[PDB]
């Protein structure tokens, strides 16, 4: 195994929390350039919540693609690449519910 | 002496008031010197007209020509300051003191 | 790429306008707006080949 | 040696002026306008958002 | 009865406009292999009526980032301005008689500059300040150069008044006298009513519409009657300074169809140049006005100085 | 009304002045610079001065444009400030135009007003004078001295425009 | 007062037809429709920045030259003296200062941009 | 104007009181976050940045991890501008 | 009624105006613009019916689409289509624009510019022939002769 950025996990838990710092400091200025209607606070609630999805992740290699990713996305927000629609996509506001009980998945429809 | 001469010499003096009272930019200032060179310009041409003091009636001319070339002295420093440091406010001609 | 089958694998198509865009930084350098808008025109790309 | 002789609590903070020139506070003064010169631009060829 | 009078300069003046409109498509198309506007009317005639109906029942937006006050202002003054610089023009005789026309042609040239920066300022637009600042480059590039030939020009003349022009030409057209001056103001002309290849400030290929990228429907409108009205009031104005026409007083239609073939000649010409030729940079036109036509104009506007009193032919002051 | 066209021209152009000193954004004290030199071209030319006014029309017009230009250069900002956009820049410009009001009231009303000087409020055609100048326009012939009179004017004027663009090469060429 | 009629005959037409632009059409003016052009993307910075001026420096000669195209427009009537020596050796001083300066301008490659 | 050692001990107090996560109830000086106040990882880095923009010295990295002590914030917040 | 007769000869004024001047933006994403171009080429000279290509969108009455939309250029275009002045129309030129066509089951493809922006007529072809898009323009301008705004106002 060849490592990307980091020999070790600490050291890619290092980038990953550099990382989360830049979004965390970019959300105000984010909602200010982008004229998104949602508060600070919850852009940082999703910051967060995109953390946590990966927070799974045990291999340094896969944590170090994974900040990369995260800061070619960062990168997209800062400059006016990623268009308000994007910036909105991580808020899934137009998909409705789906309902997560098997009861409800019963009656909706087939699927497992 | 008619009113006129009165609006002229209020112009002149509130010209003067907005030079001697800066607020932020150097541009507005400048503005303000070349508008007391305007109020200045009306008011010879008017003398020089009503007194039909005929070889006086290029006076304004040449105070119009050294109002020019005050004003580009004027631009030409205010470049130099922007560039120096990056805004025309006069809050950053600080440096000499006293 | 043909893996022997009546579809093919794989097909990479090498558009020469990539290229040209991806130079159209250096050759810019020094100019001016419409001197941009002049090699853009130069270079002769057409999107459907650099985008594919 | 001081910039002032008698100096105040608030002057005493203050530097000597510098004996040749005083140092460049280039600090990003000039920020490059940037432009969207496509995708509708006539001159894009429609399809290129070329960030200048 | 005066009143009248305006209207009679008014109105007619921008139907002229609205029919050079016409005019201009179909001499590019066919000067393109293309035929103008047809469908529209017996031969194209009725689409200038056309468009500017479409334009006065579009929607007018007001851009959220602009300044109304100027954004509104801005396309008054420049059709205001426009209006009233045919005003001084003696047509052959003029609505009003100046003793300083052409310097009150000049000073409200200048004036109208301010509409193209005031609209491209106000409308808040990358854009928009681009084709602003373009506009202050070009009149930059060509004012002095204009005042320098129109003053040259005027030397024989005897005066800046613009009727005495047709007393002063009435034995020979003033081209054959000062035809290089002639060309370089018939360029300096294009510069000032931006028009190819110094059409910069719209500059459509390089900026998507230059200083109106932001302005729809009535004042767009406005700006493009400006335009057109502009450049038949700058041809009109080269016809009666070198292109002179005979005037008997008894019958001045003779002196008015004269004046307005020629005008009508060189807007032509300013069609087929955009036609032709293609588009300069600004960098490019202000180099060409002040290091090309800059030293020549001070030879030549010496040379006129000095040749009616090496010949004794001073114009008559009166 | 058209007895008084001096004096509405003279407030406007005292109004301009109060628009401009108030020091909103350059665009707009530009553009009160420009309505004061109209109006004070019509002033002129209502006392007989129409190239003089003319000259100072086109040389302001001329100077305001590459005033806008360095502003949207050097003094920009990102709000940039109307007459309404600051207590300040409004303060100011209320204070003018009352300053204003005040004195064009007090003279019209009152026979003589004397601020700092005496002045009359007889309108401006009393003082005008009854002669002819026959065929001539003394203004042009005054103005034209300056080749045949005034030749040490133009050596002076020359020799000062001559070194104000050698003084803007040396002054902005920042080392 | 014939130039005031007609100026405000003039600007009183204009307002109308603007007056009438923004009346007579119907309107659904909502926020993207009146946001700002950037060629269908959204701007990155504002249009109230500073925006350099590569040509600072003809613009103030501009100015400067302007002053010499007031001086010399007398010249017309400069013609009519009777002293036609100094006014000609003078008004080919001025002309040939304002070529000197135009020359100094440009050999200190002042004439150039940026 | 001397930087007292207690007064930058109140800023940190205040900027942790302000931190909805941490209750006010337990907050205290010798708190260590992760374990006293529950707070994880990136809690603990987001407490960081309030304090390094309360205070306008930049808290790298590495020292920040040593972090999770209100009293280390304190300390560290010293050593960074000299007090004592 | 009179009021009725004004109404429909106004209406049938402003249509003629509409329809008459119909400037299409210069929006063109793929081969389907080059049929357009032709269109505005001398054998077609789409200037004879007054549609001119005016660049502004806010200058312009019509978009067409030509050329396929990708899920990159759809907010552009639905952006470019809001900041356009009413009336404004949209022609969708081609199977790619009119449904997704050569590429409908890819990725990065939007299945038809009706998804983004309303559609007014659809030009089937690929690309279709420039005979086919002034069909299709003139089309547009019969369903503009066809529109009855002010009679509906007078009516309501
Ligand atoms: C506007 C809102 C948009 C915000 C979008 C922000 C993003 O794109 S998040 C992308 C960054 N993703 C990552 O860094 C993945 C990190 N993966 C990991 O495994 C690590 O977090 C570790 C190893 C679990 C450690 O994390 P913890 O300290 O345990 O927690
Ligand atoms: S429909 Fe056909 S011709 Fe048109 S863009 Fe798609 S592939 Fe090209």
Same mark, same amino acid.
């Given at each position: 195994?060849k490592?990307i950025?980091? @020999?070790?996990m600490?050291?890619?838990? @290092?980038?990953?929390?550099?990382?989360?710092?830049?979004?965390?400091?970019?959300?105000?200025?984010?909602?200010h350039?982008?004229?998104?209607?949602?508060?600070?606070?919850?852009?940082?609630?999703?910051?967060?919540?995109?953390?946590?999805?990966?927070?799974?992740?045990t291999?340094? @290699?896969?944590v170090?693609?994974?900040?990369?990713?995260?800061?070619?996305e960062l990168?997209?927000?800062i400059?006016?690449?990623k268009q308000?629609?994007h910036?909105?996509?991580?808020?899934?506001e137009t998909?409705?519910?789906?309902?997560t009980?098997?009861?409800?998945?019963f009656?909706?429809?087939?699927?497992? | 002496?008619?009113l006129?001469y009165?609006?002229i010499?209020?112009?002149?003096?509130?010209?003067?008031?907005?030079l001697?009272?800066?607020?932020s930019?150097?541009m507005?200032?400048?503005?303000?010197?070349?508008?007391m060179?305007?109020?200045?310009?009306?008011?010879?041409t008017?003398?020089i007209?009503?007194?039909?003091?005929?070889?006086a009636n290029?006076?304004?001319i040449?105070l119009?020509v050294?109002?020019?070339?005050?004003?580009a002295?004027?631009?030409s420093?205010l470049v130099?300051?922007?560039?120096?440091?990056?805004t025309?406010y006069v809050?950053?001609?600080?440096?000499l003191?006293? | 790429?043909?893996?022997?089958?009546?579809?093919?694998?794989?097909?990479?198509?090498?558009?020469?306008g990539?290229?040209?865009?991806?130079?159209l930084?250096?050759?810019?350098?020094?100019?001016?707006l419409?001197?941009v808008?002049?090699?853009?025109?130069?270079?002769?790309?057409?999107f459907?080949?650099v985008?594919? | 040696?001081? +910039?002032?002789?008698?100096?105040?609590?608030?002057? +005493?903070?203050?530097?000597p002026?510098?004996?040749?020139?005083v140092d460049?506070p280039?600090?990003?003064?000039?920020?490059?306008?940037?432009?969207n010169?496509?995708?509708?631009?006539?001159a894009?060829?429609? *399809?290129?958002r070329? *960030?200048? | 009865?005066?009143?009248?009078?305006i209207?009679?300069?008014?109105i007619?003046?921008?139907?002229?406009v609205?029919?050079?409109?016409?005019?201009?498509?179909?001499?590019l198309?066919?000067?393109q292999?293309?035929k103008?506007?047809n469908?529209?009317?017996?031969?194209?005639?009725?689409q200038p009526?056309?468009?500017?109906?479409k334009?006065?029942?579009?929607?007018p937006?007001?851009?959220a980032?602009?300044?109304?006050?100027?954004?509104?202002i801005?396309?008054?003054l420049?059709?205001?301005?426009?209006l009233?610089?045919?005003?001084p023009?003696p047509?052959?005789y003029?609505?009003?008689?100046?003793?300083?026309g052409?310097?009150?042609?000049?000073?409200?040239?200048?004036?109208?500059?301010?509409?193209?920066?005031?609209?491209?300022?106000?409308?808040?637009?990358?854009?928009?300040?681009?084709?602003?600042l373009r506009?202050?480059?070009?009149?930059?590039?060509?004012?002095?150069?204009?005042?320098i030939?129109?003053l040259?020009?005027?030397?024989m003349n005897?005066?800046?008044?613009?009727?005495t022009?047709?007393?002063?030409?009435?034995?020979?057209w003033m081209?054959?006298?000062?035809?290089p001056?002639?060309?370089m103001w018939?360029?300096?002309?294009?510069?000032?009513?931006n028009?190819?290849?110094?059409?910069?400030?719209?500059?459509e290929?390089?900026?998507?519409?230059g200083?109106?990228?932001?302005?729809?429907?009535?004042?767009?409108?406005?700006?493009?009657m400006?335009?057109?009205?502009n450049?038949?009031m700058m041809?009109?104005?080269?016809?009666?300074?070198?292109?002179?026409?005979?005037?008997?007083?008894?019958?001045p239609?003779?002196?008015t169809?004269?004046?307005?073939?020629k005008?009508?000649?060189?807007?032509?010409?300013?069609?087929?140049?955009?036609?032709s030729?293609?588009r300069?940079?600004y960098?490019?036109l202000?180099?060409?006005?002040?290091?090309?036509?800059?030293?020549?104009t001070?030879a030549?506007?010496?040379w006129?100085?000095?040749?009616?009193?090496?010949?004794?032919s001073?114009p008559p002051?009166? | 009304?058209?007895?008084y066209?001096?004096?509405?021209?003279?407030?406007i152009?005292?109004?301009?002045?109060?628009?401009?000193?108030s020091?909103?954004?350059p665009?707009?004290?530009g553009?009160?610079?420009?309505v004061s030199?109209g109006?004070?071209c019509?002033?002129v030319?209502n006392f007989?001065?129409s190239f003089?006014?003319?000259?100072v029309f086109?040389?302001?017009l001329?100077?305001?444009?590459?005033?806008?230009?360095?502003?949207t250069?050097?003094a920009?900002?990102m709000?940039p400030?109307?007459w309404v956009?600051?207590?300040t820049v409004?303060?100011?410009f209320v204070?003018?135009?009352?300053?204003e009001?005040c004195?064009?009231?007090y003279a019209?009303?009152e026979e003589?007003?004397?601020?700092?000087?005496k002045?009359?409020?007889?309108?401006?055609?009393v003082?005008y004078?009854?002669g002819?100048?026959?065929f001539?326009?003394?203004e042009?012939?005054?103005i034209?001295?300056?080749?045949?009179?005034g030749?040490?004017?133009?050596?002076?004027?020359?020799?000062?425009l001559?070194?104000?663009?050698?003084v803007?090469m040396?002054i902005?060429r920042?080392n | 007062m014939?130039?005031?009629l007609?100026?405000?005959?003039?600007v009183?037409?204009?307002?109308?037809?603007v007056?009438?632009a923004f009346?007579?059409?119907?309107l659904?003016?909502?926020?993207?429709?009146?946001?700002?052009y950037?060629c269908?993307?959204?701007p990155m910075?504002?249009?109230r920045?500073?925006?350099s001026?590569?040509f600072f420096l003809?613009?103030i000669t501009?100015?400067?030259?302007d002053?010499?195209i007031?001086?010399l427009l007398?010249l017309?009537?400069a013609?009519?003296?009777?002293?036609?020596?100094?006014?000609?050796?003078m008004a080919?001083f001025?002309?040939?200062?304002?070529?000197?300066?135009?020359?100094?301008?440009?050999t200190?490659?002042?004439?150039?941009?940026a | 104007?001397?930087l007292t050692?207690?007064?930058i001990?109140?800023?940190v107090?205040?900027?942790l009181?302000?931190?909805?996560?941490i209750?006010p109830?337990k907050?205290?000086?010798?708190?260590?976050?992760?374990?006293?106040?529950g707070?994880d990882?990136?809690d603990?880095?987001?407490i960081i940045?309030?304090?390094?923009?309360?205070?306008?010295?930049?808290?790298?990295?590495?020292?920040a991890?040593?972090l999770?002590?209100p009293?280390?914030?304190?300390?560290?917040?010293?050593?960074?501008?000299?007090?004592? | 009624?009179?009021?009725e007769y004004?109404?429909?000869?106004?209406?049938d004024?402003?249509?003629?105006?509409?329809r008459?001047?119909?400037?299409p933006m210069?929006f063109?994403?793929?081969?389907?613009?080059? !049929?357009?171009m032709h269109?505005?080429?001398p054998?077609?000279?789409?200037?004879?019916?007054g549609?001119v290509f005016?660049?502004?969108?806010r200058?312009?009455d019509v978009?067409i689409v030509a050329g396929?939309?990708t899920?990159?250029?759809?907010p552009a275009?639905?952006k470019?289509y809001?900041?356009?002045?009413?009336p404004?129309y949209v022609?969708?030129?081609?199977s790619?624009?009119?449904?997704?066509?050569?590429?409908?089951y890819?990725?990065?493809?939007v299945?038809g510019?009706?998804?983004?922006?309303?559609?007014?007529?659809?030009?089937p072809?690929?690309?279709?022939?420039? !005979?086919?898009?002034?069909?299709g323009?003139?089309q547009?301008?019969?369903?503009?002769?066809?529109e009855?705004r002010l009679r509906?106002?007078?009516?309501?």
């Amino acid at each position: 195994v060849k490592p990307i950025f980091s @020999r070790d996990m600490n050291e890619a838990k @290092r980038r990953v929390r550099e990382l989360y710092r830049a979004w965390y400091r970019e959300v105000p200025n984010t909602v200010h350039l982008f004229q998104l209607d949602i508060s600070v606070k919850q852009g940082r609630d999703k910051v967060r919540e995109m953390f946590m999805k990966n927070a799974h992740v045990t291999d340094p @290699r896969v944590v170090d693609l994974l900040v990369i990713k995260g800061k070619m996305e960062l990168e997209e927000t800062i400059n006016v690449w990623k268009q308000r629609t994007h910036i909105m996509r991580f808020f899934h506001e137009t998909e409705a519910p789906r309902p997560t009980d098997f009861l409800s998945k019963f009656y909706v429809g087939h699927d497992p | 002496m008619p009113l006129v001469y009165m609006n002229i010499i209020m112009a002149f003096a509130i010209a003067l008031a907005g030079l001697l009272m800066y607020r932020s930019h150097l541009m507005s200032s400048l503005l303000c010197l070349e508008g007391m060179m305007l109020s200045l310009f009306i008011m010879s041409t008017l003398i020089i007209l009503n007194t039909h003091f005929t070889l006086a009636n290029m006076m304004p001319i040449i105070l119009l020509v050294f109002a020019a070339c005050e004003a580009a002295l004027g631009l030409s420093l205010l470049v130099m300051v922007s560039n120096t440091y990056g805004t025309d406010y006069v809050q950053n001609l600080n440096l000499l003191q006293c | 790429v043909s893996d022997g089958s009546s579809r093919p694998y794989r097909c990479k198509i090498k558009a020469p306008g990539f290229a040209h865009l991806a130079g159209l930084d250096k050759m810019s350098k020094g100019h001016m707006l419409a001197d941009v808008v002049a090699i853009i025109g130069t270079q002769d790309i057409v999107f459907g080949e650099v985008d594919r | 040696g001081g +910039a002032v002789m008698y100096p105040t609590k608030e002057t +005493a903070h203050w530097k000597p002026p510098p004996w040749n020139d005083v140092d460049p506070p280039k600090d990003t003064l000039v920020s490059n306008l940037t432009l969207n010169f496509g995708p509708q631009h006539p001159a894009a060829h429609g *399809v290129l958002r070329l *960030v200048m | 009865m005066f009143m009248i009078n305006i209207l009679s300069l008014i109105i007619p003046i921008l139907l002229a406009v609205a029919f050079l409109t016409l005019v201009e498509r179909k001499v590019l198309g066919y000067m393109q292999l293309r035929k103008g506007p047809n469908v529209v009317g017996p031969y194209g005639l009725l689409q200038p009526i056309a468009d500017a109906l479409k334009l006065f029942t579009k929607e007018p937006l007001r851009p959220a980032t602009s300044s109304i006050s100027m954004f509104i202002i801005a396309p008054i003054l420049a059709l205001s301005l426009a209006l009233t610089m045919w005003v001084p023009l003696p047509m052959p005789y003029p609505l009003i008689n100046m003793n300083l026309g052409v310097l009150f042609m000049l000073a409200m040239s200048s004036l109208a500059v301010y509409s193209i920066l005031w609209s491209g300022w106000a409308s808040n637009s990358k854009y928009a300040l681009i084709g602003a600042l373009r506009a202050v480059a070009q009149t930059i590039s060509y004012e002095v150069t204009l005042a320098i030939i129109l003053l040259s020009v005027l030397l024989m003349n005897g005066s800046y008044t613009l009727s005495t022009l047709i007393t002063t030409q009435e034995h020979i057209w003033m081209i054959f006298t000062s035809w290089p001056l002639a060309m370089m103001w018939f360029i300096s002309t294009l510069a000032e009513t931006n028009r190819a290849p110094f059409d910069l400030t719209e500059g459509e290929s390089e900026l998507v519409s230059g200083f109106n990228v932001e302005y729809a429907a009535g004042p767009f409108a406005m700006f493009f009657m400006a335009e057109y009205a502009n450049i038949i009031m700058m041809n009109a104005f080269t016809a009666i300074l070198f292109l002179g026409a005979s005037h008997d007083p008894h019958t001045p239609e003779l002196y008015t169809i004269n004046f307005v073939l020629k005008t009508l000649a060189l807007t032509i010409t300013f069609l087929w140049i955009r036609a032709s030729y293609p588009r300069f940079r600004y960098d490019q036109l202000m180099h060409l006005l002040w290091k090309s036509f800059l030293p020549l104009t001070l030879a030549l506007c010496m040379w006129h100085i000095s040749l009616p009193i090496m010949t004794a032919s001073i114009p008559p002051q009166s | 009304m058209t007895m008084y066209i001096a004096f509405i021209l003279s407030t406007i152009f005292v109004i301009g002045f109060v628009g401009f000193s108030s020091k909103p954004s350059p665009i707009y004290g530009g553009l009160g610079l420009i309505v004061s030199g109209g109006v004070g071209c019509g002033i002129v030319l209502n006392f007989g001065g129409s190239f003089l006014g003319l000259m100072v029309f086109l040389i302001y017009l001329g100077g305001m444009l590459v005033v806008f230009g360095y502003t949207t250069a050097m003094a920009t900002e990102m709000y940039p400030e109307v007459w309404v956009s600051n207590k300040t820049v409004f303060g100011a410009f209320v204070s003018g135009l009352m300053m204003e009001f005040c004195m064009v009231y007090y003279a019209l009303k009152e026979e003589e007003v004397e601020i700092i000087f005496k002045f009359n409020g007889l309108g401006d055609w009393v003082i005008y004078d009854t002669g002819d100048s026959g065929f001539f326009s003394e203004e042009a012939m005054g103005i034209a001295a300056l080749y045949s009179y005034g030749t040490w004017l133009v050596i002076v004027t020359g020799w000062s425009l001559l070194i104000g663009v050698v003084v803007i090469m040396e002054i902005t060429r920042g080392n | 007062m014939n130039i005031m009629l007609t100026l405000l005959t003039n600007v009183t037409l204009a307002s109308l037809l603007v007056l009438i632009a923004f009346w007579l059409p119907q309107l659904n003016a909502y926020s993207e429709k009146t946001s700002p052009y950037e060629c269908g993307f959204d701007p990155m910075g504002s249009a109230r920045l500073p925006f350099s001026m590569k040509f600072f420096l003809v613009a103030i000669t501009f100015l400067l030259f302007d002053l010499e195209i007031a001086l010399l427009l007398p010249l017309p009537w400069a013609s009519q003296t009777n002293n036609l020596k100094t006014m000609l050796t003078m008004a080919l001083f001025l002309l040939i200062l304002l070529a000197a300066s135009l020359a100094y301008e440009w050999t200190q490659k002042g004439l150039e941009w940026a | 104007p001397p930087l007292t050692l207690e007064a930058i001990k109140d800023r940190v107090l205040y900027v942790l009181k302000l931190y909805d996560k941490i209750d006010p109830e337990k907050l205290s000086v010798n708190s260590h976050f992760m374990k006293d106040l529950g707070l994880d990882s990136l809690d603990q880095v987001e407490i960081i940045m309030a304090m390094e923009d309360e205070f306008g010295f930049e808290i790298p990295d590495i020292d920040a991890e040593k972090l999770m002590c209100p009293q280390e914030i304190v300390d560290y917040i010293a050593d960074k501008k000299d007090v004592y | 009624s009179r009021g009725e007769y004004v109404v429909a000869k106004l209406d049938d004024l402003v249509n003629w105006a509409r329809r008459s001047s119909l400037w299409p933006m210069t929006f063109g994403l793929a081969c389907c613009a080059v !049929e357009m171009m032709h269109m505005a080429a001398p054998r077609y000279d789409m200037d004879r019916f007054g549609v001119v290509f005016r660049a502004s969108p806010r200058q312009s009455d019509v978009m067409i689409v030509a050329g396929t939309l990708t899920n990159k250029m759809a907010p552009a275009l639905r952006k470019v289509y809001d900041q356009m002045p009413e009336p404004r129309y949209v022609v969708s030129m081609g199977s790619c624009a009119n449904g997704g066509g050569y590429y409908h089951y890819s990725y990065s493809v939007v299945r038809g510019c009706d998804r983004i922006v309303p559609v007014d007529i659809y030009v089937p072809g690929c690309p279709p022939t420039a !005979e086919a898009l002034l069909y299709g323009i003139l089309q547009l301008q019969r369903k503009i002769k066809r529109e009855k705004r002010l009679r509906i106002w007078y009516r309501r």
